[PDB]
Amino acid sequence: CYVRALFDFNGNDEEDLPFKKGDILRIRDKPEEQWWNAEDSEGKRGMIPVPYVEKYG
């Protein structure tokens, strides 16, 4: 129920869930086929790149 973001990304464009190369995100929603809704290290649910993140849990 998590993913490892092997790509950095800290900004604020489309509310995309930011992260740092080698981060973990808890994916709970996977509507799109690349941008899934996962949580950050604070629970903040946002858009996470499946191509930039791996499947962990």
mmCIF file of C-alpha atoms in Angstrom:
data_model
loop_
_atom_site.group_PDB
_atom_site.id
_atom_site.type_symbol
_atom_site.label_atom_id
_atom_site.label_comp_id
_atom_site.label_asym_id
_atom_site.label_seq_id
_atom_site.Cartn_x
_atom_site.Cartn_y
_atom_site.Cartn_z
ATOM 1 C CA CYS A 1 0.000 0.000 0.000
ATOM 2 C CA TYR A 2 2.960 2.222 -0.791
ATOM 3 C CA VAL A 3 5.291 3.305 -3.570
ATOM 4 C CA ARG A 4 8.909 4.395 -3.794
ATOM 5 C CA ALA A 5 9.409 7.627 -5.698
ATOM 6 C CA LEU A 6 12.768 7.295 -7.410
ATOM 7 C CA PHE A 7 12.327 10.868 -8.580
ATOM 8 C CA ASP A 8 12.461 14.211 -6.811
ATOM 9 C CA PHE A 9 9.639 16.716 -7.102
ATOM 10 C CA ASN A 10 8.896 19.623 -4.794
ATOM 11 C CA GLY A 11 6.720 22.401 -6.163
ATOM 12 C CA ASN A 12 3.030 23.098 -6.629
ATOM 13 C CA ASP A 13 1.460 22.950 -10.070
ATOM 14 C CA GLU A 14 -1.574 20.689 -10.160
ATOM 15 C CA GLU A 15 -1.430 19.818 -6.480
ATOM 16 C CA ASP A 16 0.806 16.953 -7.535
ATOM 17 C CA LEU A 17 2.151 15.079 -4.534
ATOM 18 C CA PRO A 18 5.776 16.212 -4.225
ATOM 19 C CA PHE A 19 8.628 14.054 -2.988
ATOM 20 C CA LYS A 20 12.361 13.427 -3.001
ATOM 21 C CA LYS A 21 14.309 10.889 -5.021
ATOM 22 C CA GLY A 22 13.943 7.807 -2.854
ATOM 23 C CA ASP A 23 10.717 8.662 -1.071
ATOM 24 C CA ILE A 24 7.747 6.540 -0.071
ATOM 25 C CA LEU A 25 4.098 7.283 -0.748
ATOM 26 C CA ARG A 26 1.016 5.412 0.404
ATOM 27 C CA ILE A 27 -1.128 4.826 -2.660
ATOM 28 C CA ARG A 28 -4.784 4.283 -1.847
ATOM 29 C CA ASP A 29 -6.399 5.433 -5.071
ATOM 30 C CA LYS A 30 -5.316 4.436 -8.559
ATOM 31 C CA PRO A 31 -7.817 6.026 -10.954
ATOM 32 C CA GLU A 32 -5.358 7.042 -13.645
ATOM 33 C CA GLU A 33 -2.864 4.751 -15.337
ATOM 34 C CA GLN A 34 0.131 6.727 -14.134
ATOM 35 C CA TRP A 35 -1.043 9.324 -11.644
ATOM 36 C CA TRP A 36 -2.388 7.608 -8.550
ATOM 37 C CA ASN A 37 -3.522 9.243 -5.331
ATOM 38 C CA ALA A 38 -1.040 8.413 -2.597
ATOM 39 C CA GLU A 39 -0.087 9.881 0.759
ATOM 40 C CA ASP A 40 3.181 11.531 1.722
ATOM 41 C CA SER A 41 5.242 11.242 4.883
ATOM 42 C CA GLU A 42 2.525 13.295 6.535
ATOM 43 C CA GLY A 43 -0.523 11.565 5.105
ATOM 44 C CA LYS A 44 -1.003 14.357 2.595
ATOM 45 C CA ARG A 45 -2.887 12.674 -0.223
ATOM 46 C CA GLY A 46 -1.969 13.862 -3.697
ATOM 47 C CA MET A 47 -1.028 12.773 -7.198
ATOM 48 C CA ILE A 48 1.981 10.489 -7.428
ATOM 49 C CA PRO A 49 3.705 9.420 -10.653
ATOM 50 C CA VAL A 50 3.608 5.657 -11.051
ATOM 51 C CA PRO A 51 6.438 5.975 -13.581
ATOM 52 C CA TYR A 52 8.479 7.907 -11.046
ATOM 53 C CA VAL A 53 7.443 5.660 -8.182
ATOM 54 C CA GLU A 54 7.686 1.924 -7.628
ATOM 55 C CA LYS A 55 5.279 -0.561 -6.092
ATOM 56 C CA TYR A 56 6.235 -1.416 -2.532
ATOM 57 C CA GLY A 57 3.151 -2.123 -0.456
#
